[PDB]
Amino acid sequence: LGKDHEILRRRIENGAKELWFFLQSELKKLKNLEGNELQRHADEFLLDLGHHERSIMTDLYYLSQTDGAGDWREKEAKDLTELVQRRITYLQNPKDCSKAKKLVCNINKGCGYGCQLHHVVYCFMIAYGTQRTLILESQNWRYATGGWETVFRPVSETCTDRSGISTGHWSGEVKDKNVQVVELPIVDSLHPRPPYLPLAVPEDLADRLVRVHGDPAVWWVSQFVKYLIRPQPWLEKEIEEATKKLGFKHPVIGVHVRRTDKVGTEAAFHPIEEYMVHVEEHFQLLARRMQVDKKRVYLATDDPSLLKEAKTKYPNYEFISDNSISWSAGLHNRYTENSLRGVILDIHFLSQADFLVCTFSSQVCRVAYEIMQTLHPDASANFHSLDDIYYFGGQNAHNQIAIYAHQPRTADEIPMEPGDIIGVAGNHWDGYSKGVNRKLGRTGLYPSYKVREKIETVKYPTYPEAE
Amino acid sequence: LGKDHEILRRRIENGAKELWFFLQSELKKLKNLEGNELQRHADEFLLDLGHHERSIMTDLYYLSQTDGAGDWREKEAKDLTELVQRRITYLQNPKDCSKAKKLVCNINKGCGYGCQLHHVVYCFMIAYGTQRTLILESQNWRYATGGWETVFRPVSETCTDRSGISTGHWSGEVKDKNVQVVELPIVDSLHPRPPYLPLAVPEDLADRLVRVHGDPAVWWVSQFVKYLIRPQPWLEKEIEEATKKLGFKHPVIGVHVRRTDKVGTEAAFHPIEEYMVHVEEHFQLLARRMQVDKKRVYLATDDPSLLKEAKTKYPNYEFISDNSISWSAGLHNRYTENSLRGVILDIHFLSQADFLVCTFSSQVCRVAYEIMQTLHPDASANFHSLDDIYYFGGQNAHNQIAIYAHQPRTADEIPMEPGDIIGVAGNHWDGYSKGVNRKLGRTGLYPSYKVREKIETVKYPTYPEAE
Ligand SMILES: CC(=O)N[C@@H]1[C@@H](O)[C@H](O[C@@H]2O[C@H](CO)[C@@H](O[C@@H]3O[C@H](CO)[C@@H](O)[C@H](O[C@H]4O[C@H](CO)[C@@H](O)[C@H](O)[C@@H]4O[C@@H]4O[C@H](CO)[C@@H](O)[C@H](O)[C@H]4NC(C)=O)[C@@H]3O)[C@H](O)[C@H]2NC(C)=O)[C@@H](CO)O[C@H]1O
Ligand SMILES: Nc1nc2c(ncn2[C@@H]2O[C@H](COP(=O)(O)OP(=O)(O)O)[C@@H](O)[C@H]2O)c(=O)[nH]1
Ligand SMILES: Nc1nc2c(ncn2[C@@H]2O[C@H](COP(=O)(O)OP(=O)(O)O)[C@@H](O)[C@H]2O)c(=O)[nH]1
């Protein structure tokens, strides 16, 4: 055992005890207070708590890094990335393209970039499970009629032709076993659904992923995003120039403010203060472990009027943003190459940030979060979503397993016994989540800490020929 | 890295986050409440917090045991105990007693048992540092004029005689370098003081002890307590019989209620409910990790009227206690052999408990806590004192090091800068401690989590010939 490891384990332990002592004392005092006297004492209480809590989260971070734990995790995560990218690349480049089994994917799903991009990942992940090379049809793409290679590398160097001796629409892996070329529709109309879908992960990688990553389901998705978004040279160069142009440096926290057409249809309007309370919080945590020269924020939004508002309200912050990109994201000009290049750039810098504050109901932020997983060993917790938990459109039921019992205090809560399977709908970021107790068919709230994630595994191919 | 180790570290991490989510939300709710509604909401809040907090402490326990950490810590602590006991036995049994260097200690210090026992421990630690054999004079002992061997084994098998060519009173290790037999007074009037005192530890054991034990200073003391209290055969049998008669079995929590002459002089009167809130708390913690057949408590007290009160007020508890021993602890019969054997038994069963709730102002509980350290790898946190932190009468200044800054919110608090040395006087068990900032000469309260223990080391002899 490590000297610093035990020191840290005990400092975290004792720090929690003192926190419990602190809580009990101040609450007993609070029960005897009223009005402003009550409200000021509660505010001072909250300030003191945040620092204490952050001291514990800092000791927890150090524990995750002490005694070579950080060095090992990066090497293993690196070995895992290399392995998958090696298998994907092998699958994507058969010797004889005319005789390879293929799966055709059409990019023109009726939605935005991140949603269309997730369609390709959904296509790619099933092509992986079926040992079929992915063929991506991207002509007449709404962001770029020139197609996929307007921005990114082709998904294959040897097999980009879709010809085959037999062709047909999706009907099942078994039924299509002797069909060379299979056309795959969007997940919304996929029947029958195969098991190669989120949030499951390859059975052969399950044990290694749990040791490294706090959310393997996102990591698995990120591996296909990592492959797809290989930039064309001019795009690679422009990212390199934008990085230098915007003075993009660390430490930096990424913020995605999705407004415009999303409001009133798939999400709500969130004031800028709802985002910045968590940015400031995180900078207070990082300050506990390093020197914060300047409080930097990369702001990605389709509201071009927001940057002036933000700079006005937070003058001690350095806001890094491309307002012309935000303007290009406008509804009247959203579906062009220039706007496409804009959102690609914004997502890149969001993914490169040290922390991500946004709304996961927007696919733009979910992509940045996914890419982030490829830049760090375990960046699963390096975010805060103002609404939805992480999800992938079309995923199988996101389930959890109750580990502690719960008796409802109100009719709006649901009971839980250890072992109950809970299908989570979301986290309210108030200590409570919302979901259904499948055993009872009741829906309602439950404490977010009394459940555990039910990790799903699928027997994927392992492509041993790629070594 | 171990799979379960990482799972636990992340679950501790997330549990703290969800606790932080829970706190902010419910506090925001509390600021808008009044009257009974306010007090009901705070009480329900505390119930939810205790369980949540205990769920985190349980995972922290598992972390201390995962991946063979429990087996290693148990093995290492065993080798350290055997090593020190091997050295002590070597020092205490020279071949030629007539030529050995000796240090004479008289047991009849004017105080109770635990205080007199600490006198011998204080004598023993200095004899150890000076490479002198301890000769214990225990005639006219107030609990047993027959002497030390009425209950315990002699401290030496070869050298119990005090003869020597030169004798003198204590005057310094340097001045006594050629004085064979040195007489040592009580610490309260000791001049000059040697460095072989609590709460310092041998320089050669610092790294190994910090790695294993959460409070090395107590472990060091416990090694001398362990040696002294080696029971005579008839005493060993009596304990074995009492264990069987009292149905002493696990799980069990030890409770020491010191009253009578202590109240109003060296401590305060504490109702039984103040003790049982922490007993119940821990049984709620233990239930999270094991099957708790029955909530057992071993009650040691000098108030013979207390046992019936407890049985009446807590009918769901099984109280193990010998009331005739409590009667023997009365002021008119305190200093007899029958009473002496009684308190020895009480301390034994207190030390054997899985947790110790008491007042550390009573030397009776400090001995049980020390002995407890010899029964487990790291039992440093297996206690709760209603008043004083751990201390050893005559210790050098117990100092701490501030790790986080603090700005006083009231005049009753003191400021701290990181690295400042703070002389601790005690912990108020409410999130605040009390002490003096030696850099400023200011005394007052400060957050208990912003400080770190300054572990002190002393170059003791190592007795390499004992191998
Ligand atoms: C000549 C002779 O033979 N002398 C012996 C003594 O050696 C023998 O033992 C001595 O007993 C005393 C008192 O039991 C003990 O003193 C303590 O030393 C502690 C360490 O420095 C110190 O912290 C203690 O002070 C607390 O308690 C006293 C009251 O006893 C209060 O007045 C103080 O304010 C302290 O109160 C604590 O304060 C903190 C912070 O405010 C609180 O967190 C905590 O809850 C408070 N606790 C209480 C109970 O209020 C105390 O001064 C000696 O260490 C000890 N010495 C030795 C060598 O054993 C004595 C035993 O009866 O008999 C004499 O004949
Ligand atoms: N450049 C840029 N474009 C954005 C931003 N937010 C939204 N957009 C545009 O709006 C589209 C929304 O499509 P989508 O990726 O499916 O995300 P969602 O509809 O918010 O879930 C994006 O693809 C962009 O074209 C932004 O912050 N920056
Ligand atoms: N048998 C028994 N005796 C006790 C108990 N509590 C106190 N006493 C007696 O009271 C004395 C107190 O002396 P001491 O050990 O120096 O500790 P302190 O005065 O409580 O700090 C003890 O030595 C016992 O003789 C108890 O729980 N059981």
Side-chain angles (χ1 to χ4, degrees), chain B residues 333-361:
Chain B
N333 48 2
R334 180 166 290 177
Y335 303 110
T336 62
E337 171 182 312
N338 183 247
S339 161
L340 167 66
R341 304 176 91 146
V343 63
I344 291 179
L345 259 56
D346 279 334
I347 288 182
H348 172 268
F349 293 129
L350 289 176
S351 65
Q352 292 278 328
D354 307 296
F355 195 70
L356 186 56
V357 180
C358 73
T359 55
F360 272 176
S361 49

Side-chain angles (χ1 to χ4, degrees), chain B residues 408-423:
Chain B
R409 187 170 273 114
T410 70
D412 296 2
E413 304 179 15
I414 57 166
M416 297 185 305
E417 294 296 311
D420 291 352
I421 301 181
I422 280 77

Side-chain angles (χ1 to χ4, degrees), chain A residues 328-355:
Chain A
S328 73
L331 294 175
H332 296 261
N333 40 255
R334 181 167 292 177
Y335 302 109
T336 181
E337 293 83 330
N338 184 248
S339 162
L340 168 66
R341 169 204 72 90
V343 62
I344 292 178
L345 259 56
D346 278 334
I347 288 182
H348 172 269
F349 292 131
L350 289 177
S351 65
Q352 293 278 328
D354 307 296
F355 196 71

Side-chain angles (χ1 to χ4, degrees), chain B residues 112-115 143 256 258 262 300-301 325 329 334 346 362-363:
Chain B
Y113 170 70
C115 162
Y143 284 96
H256 172 58
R258 177 79 167 89
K262 191 88 165 177
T301 177
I325 287 186
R334 180 166 290 177
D346 279 334
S362 167
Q363 319 226 17

Side-chain angles (χ1 to χ4, degrees), chain A residues 117-238:
Chain A
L117 180 68
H118 287 146
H119 175 50
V120 186
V121 176
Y122 137 83
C123 283
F124 214 160
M125 191 166 316
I126 298 181
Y128 189 94
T130 58
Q131 319 198 0
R132 296 190 172 262
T133 297
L134 176 71
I135 307 298
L136 180 62
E137 301 192 321
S138 61
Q139 289 299 319
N140 293 325
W141 190 16
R142 76 203 305 192
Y143 282 95
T145 58
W148 172 261
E149 283 136 291
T150 311
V151 281
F152 297 129
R153 298 272 300 284
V155 301
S156 170
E157 299 294 328
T158 79
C159 202
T160 54
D161 176 289
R162 70 170 290 171
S163 57
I165 65 175
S166 60
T167 319
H169 299 282
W170 170 272
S171 63
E173 180 173 3
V174 180
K175 299 199 175 189
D176 301 323
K177 67 164 291 191
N178 289 127
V179 174
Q180 181 178 2
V181 185
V182 171
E183 305 179 21
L184 188 73
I186 64 176
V187 62
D188 317 67
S189 60
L190 183 61
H191 314 285
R193 284 163 60 90
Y196 319 113
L197 295 169
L199 297 167
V201 296
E203 183 174 340
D204 44 305
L205 307 181
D207 288 352
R208 303 180 63 186
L209 281 180
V210 180
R211 276 185 282 265
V212 178
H213 207 268
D215 192 340
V218 190
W219 188 94
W220 183 230
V221 173
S222 70
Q223 291 313 291
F224 298 93
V225 174
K226 183 187 200 311
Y227 181 94
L228 289 174
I229 67 178
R230 291 161 308 144
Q232 296 276 34
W234 66 269
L235 183 59
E236 192 172 12
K237 180 188 176 185
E238 183 163 19

